[PDB]
Design a protein around this ligand. Sequence first.
Ligand SMILES: Nc1ncnc2c1ncn2[C@@H]1O[C@H](COP(=O)(O)OCCCCC[C@@H]2SC[C@@H]3NC(=O)N[C@@H]32)[C@@H](O)[C@H]1O
Ligand SMILES: Nc1ncnc2c1ncn2[C@@H]1O[C@H](COP(=O)(O)OCCCCC[C@@H]2SC[C@@H]3NC(=O)N[C@@H]32)[C@@H](O)[C@H]1O
Lengths: 235, 232
Amino acid sequence: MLGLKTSIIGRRVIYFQEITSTNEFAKTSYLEEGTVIVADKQTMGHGALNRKWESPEGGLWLSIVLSPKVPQKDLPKIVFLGAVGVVETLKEFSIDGRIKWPNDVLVNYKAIAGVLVEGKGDKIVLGIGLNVNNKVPNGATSMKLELGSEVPLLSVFRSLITNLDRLYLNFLKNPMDILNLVRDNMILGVRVKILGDGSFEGIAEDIDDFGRLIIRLDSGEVKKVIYGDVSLRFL
Amino acid sequence: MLGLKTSIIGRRVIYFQEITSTNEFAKTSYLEEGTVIVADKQTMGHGALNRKWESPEGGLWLSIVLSPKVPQKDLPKIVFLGAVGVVETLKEFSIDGRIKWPNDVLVNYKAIAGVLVEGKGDKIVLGIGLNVNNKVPNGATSMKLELGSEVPLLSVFRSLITNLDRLYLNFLKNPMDILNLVRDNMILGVRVKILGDGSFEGIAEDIDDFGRLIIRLDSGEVKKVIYGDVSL
Ligand SMILES: Nc1ncnc2c1ncn2[C@@H]1O[C@H](COP(=O)(O)OCCCCC[C@@H]2SC[C@@H]3NC(=O)N[C@@H]32)[C@@H](O)[C@H]1O
Ligand SMILES: Nc1ncnc2c1ncn2[C@@H]1O[C@H](COP(=O)(O)OCCCCC[C@@H]2SC[C@@H]3NC(=O)N[C@@H]32)[C@@H](O)[C@H]1O
């Protein structure tokens, strides 16, 4: 009854009044590529390292099952698909979303959405949490809060699914294209702190041909950051 | 993201751009009670027996998984929940639908919807096909044809699920209630022909406590129909 016209993403959609976590359900269940798992609220929503992701009613919490037939070296770029998709949808609603490498989208430096990719080769789960009309934790914001009025949740869903399907289809043909879009929509030219094995500060200059964040330390030394257990903090 | 507020029916919804048949999928897949299977289009939609149910884009084609902890004798009434639900939804949209025993809903005698219940194991599948904005077979009708304008398909879905959830919850507690709701919305007091072998005609008088159609033949003899096709 939804009348979705996408080619892959959204061929099927499983909606939940409530669920533990759409990412957990998508990873665990036997599902076809392109299936979208969406719920009004999550009781056990999570980010990386099982960090808690607040998922109250009013937000868009979903996961997409993917089976990307591209070189293994391109797989890490899936997270960018989600990030850019969100940015494009926000722009459609006239909200200025900017990407915080590699998986967050901010508005005025406040987190409005987060992306989490999990998988293992043949099966990749693209998870996206976007605050629309829901209450949010400090440090975050929502579409409603930015526009000063509530936004039809279904309209946001349709917008995002349409955008992701297009991005994904092009990704299968040209896996490098998404890097240009991330670059054009990411926060750069400012000082950032990278938290990992230790920590260092520098100017976020750009992302390279592998999606690595290029940071210039005061000393002039260039470091290339690979995401995966490293957190980025703006100063 | 649909924000459904129903108690059982609609707890989960599985949507398909395209599918063979929502009833078939519901029968062969493990799904929790209340799960709704819905698709924009069915390539192998079916009615009773070996009949095809045209299911092009624009209509509402869905199936609901139920597991009624009620006596065995009440299960034949599930089809009525579907039919009454459709009638109630049609009324919300200013359309007067009447039930043609035991599973069809007609508007001015043109079929606008059909219900098909199939029991599999101890799970019951309630299938409903309602013509909204889609093209229909000659002689049939749709909500669009009755109203003269395109009807928001999702609005019809929300309305129907809400009505069905209410009807079902009450059915679990008071299984006889549905019978009177059917009687007040069914085509009665008219001559009909019970098709098939031993075909016969008579006046459709009412439905009894089991949901059987009561027919009075011209001879004065009374027959009770459990199932079959009725022609007005
Ligand atoms: N509602 C919120 N808005 C803004 N910030 C918040 C919110 N809830 C929690 N946070 C903050 O975000 C952090 C999680 O960040 P992350 O690990 O980068 O991981 C980010 C990835 C999140 C993916 C979320 C989706 S929801 C659909 C799917 N199901 C699921 O369980 N996860 C994904 C938390 O530690 C917290 O400080
Ligand atoms: N779109 C239509 N509108 C009006 N009349 C039509 C339409 N398509 C076919 N018909 C006529 O209705 C008859 C089917 O009637 P039925 O056996 O009483 O069986 C009726 C039960 C139908 C249940 C349909 C739902 S759709 C969701 C679910 N999935 C599935 O495969 N079946 C059910 C056909 O033989 C045909 O003449």
